[PDB]
Write a protein that binds this ligand. Structure first.
Ligand SMILES: *CCC(=O)Nc1cccc(C)c1Nc1ncc(OCc2c(Cl)c(OC)cc(OC)c2Cl)cn1
Length: 271
C-alpha cells in the first residue's frame, strides 16, 4: 500500500510494544536505536496505530497526520515524529512520550492543600506559558493552525518541558473557542491566540475548569455582551492583562504568538 520513506522508516523488529496509553489506539513502546549515535540504547516512545475495525478513511487520516508531522518538522516545544513502520505490517507512527502526562493533570496534581504554598513558583508557571507560546509560534511559522489548544493538549517531559500534542490531526470544546470559530466555524492563528488566553487562565488556576458554573448555553451570550473570566486568585495583573488581550472580540486586536513570546520573555527577564 504505502511507499517506504528512507528519511523516517524505523525497523519494527526494534520496536517493543508495551501498555496501551489510550483507545485506532496509542501504545507505549521501547525503541532501540532512535539515537543513531548509540544504536543499542533504548528510549520510551508512543506509537499510534489503527484497530482492526478501521475503515479506508481511518487509514487516510493517520497517513495525513504522519505526512503533516514530517512536513512541519521538529521543535523543542512540540511532540515530535521519531519514525514510522509502513512496510510488511500495520502502519505505526512513532512519537516522543512525555513522562509527566498532560499539563492540566500536572498542574492539578501539584495543587497545595487549601491556602498553603504549592511546589509551582510564579517563574515556573510563566515558563510553562512561555514554552507553549514558543511551540505555537513555531507551528504558526509552519502554517499549522492547532484548532484545539488547551492544557489537556500540552504534555510535560521528565525535565518539565512543555510539548504541544495533536497539532497534525485531520478535520465540542466550546469554552476554548474564539467567537469567530463558535459562530462562523472559522479557525485561524488568531483563533488559536484566543485559546492560548484560556490556557493561560488554566495555568494560573493550576488546571481550573473555565467559566466555572456558567453552562455552555449562557457562554455565547456572556461573550457577546463583552464579559470574560475574572482574574484568578494570586494572578498578577500583567498576566491577566495578557489573557484579556487574547480575548479581544476582533481577531486583529489580539496579540500574535510572536508578541506573546516577547511579553512572557519580558516577565521572566524581570524576575
Ligand atoms: C512516556 C511515558 C508515559 O506513559 N507517558 C504518559 C502517561 C500518561 C499520560 C500521558 C499523556 C503520557 N504521555 C504521552 N502520552 C502520549 C503521547 O503521544 C501521543 C501522540 C501520538 Cl501517538 C501522536 O501520533 C501521531 C501524535 C501526538 O501529537 C503530535 C501525540 Cl501527543 C506522548 N506522551
Amino acid at each position: 500500500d504505502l511507499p517506504l520513506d528512507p528519511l523516517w522508516e524505523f525497523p519494527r523488529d526494534r520496536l517493543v510494544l508495551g501498555k496501551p496509553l489510550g483507545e485506532g489506539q496509542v501504545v507505549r513502546a521501547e525503541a532501540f536505536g532512535m539515537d543513531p549515535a548509540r544504536p543499542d540504547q533504548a528510549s520510551t516512545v508512543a506509537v499510534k496505530m489503527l484497530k482492526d475495525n478501521a475503515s479506508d478513511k481511518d487509514l487516510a487520516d493517520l497517513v495525513s497526520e504522519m505526512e503533516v508531522m514530517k512536513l512541519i518538522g521538529r521543535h523543542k516545544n512540540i511532540i515530535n515524529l521519531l519514525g514510522v513502520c509502513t512496510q510488511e505490517g500495520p502502519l505505526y507512527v512513532i512519537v516522543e512520550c512525555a513522562a509527566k502526562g498532560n499539563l492540566r493533570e500536572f498542574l492539578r496534581a501539584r495543587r497545595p492543600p487549601g491556602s498553603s504554598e504549592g511546589p509551582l513558583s510564579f517563574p515556573v508557571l510563566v515558563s510553562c506559558a512561555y514554552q507553549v507560546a514558543r511551540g505555537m509560534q513555531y507551528l504558526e511559522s509552519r502554517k499549522c493552525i492547532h484548532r484545539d489548544l488547551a492544557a489537556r493538549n500540552v504534555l510535560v517531559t521528565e525535565d518539565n518541558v512543555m510539548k504541544i500534542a495533536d497539532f497534525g490531526l485531520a478535520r465540542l470544546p466550546v469554552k476554548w473557542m474564539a467567537p469567530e470559530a463558535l459562530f462562523d466555524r472559522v479557525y485561524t492563528h488568531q483563533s488559536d491566540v484566543w485559546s492560548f488566553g484560556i490556557l493561560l487562565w488554566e495555568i494560573f488556576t493550576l488546571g481550573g475548569s473555565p467559566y466555572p458554573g456558567i453552562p455552555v448555553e449562557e457562554l455565547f451570550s456572556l461573550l457577546r455582551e463583552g464579559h470574560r473570566m475574572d482574574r484568578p486568585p494570586h494572578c498578577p495583573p500583567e498576566l491577566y492583562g495578557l489573557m484579556r488581550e487574547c480575548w479581544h472580540a476582533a481577531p486583529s486586536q489580539r496579540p500574535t504568538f510572536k508578541q506573546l513570546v516577547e511579553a512572557l520573555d519580558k516577565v521572566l527577564l524581570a524576575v
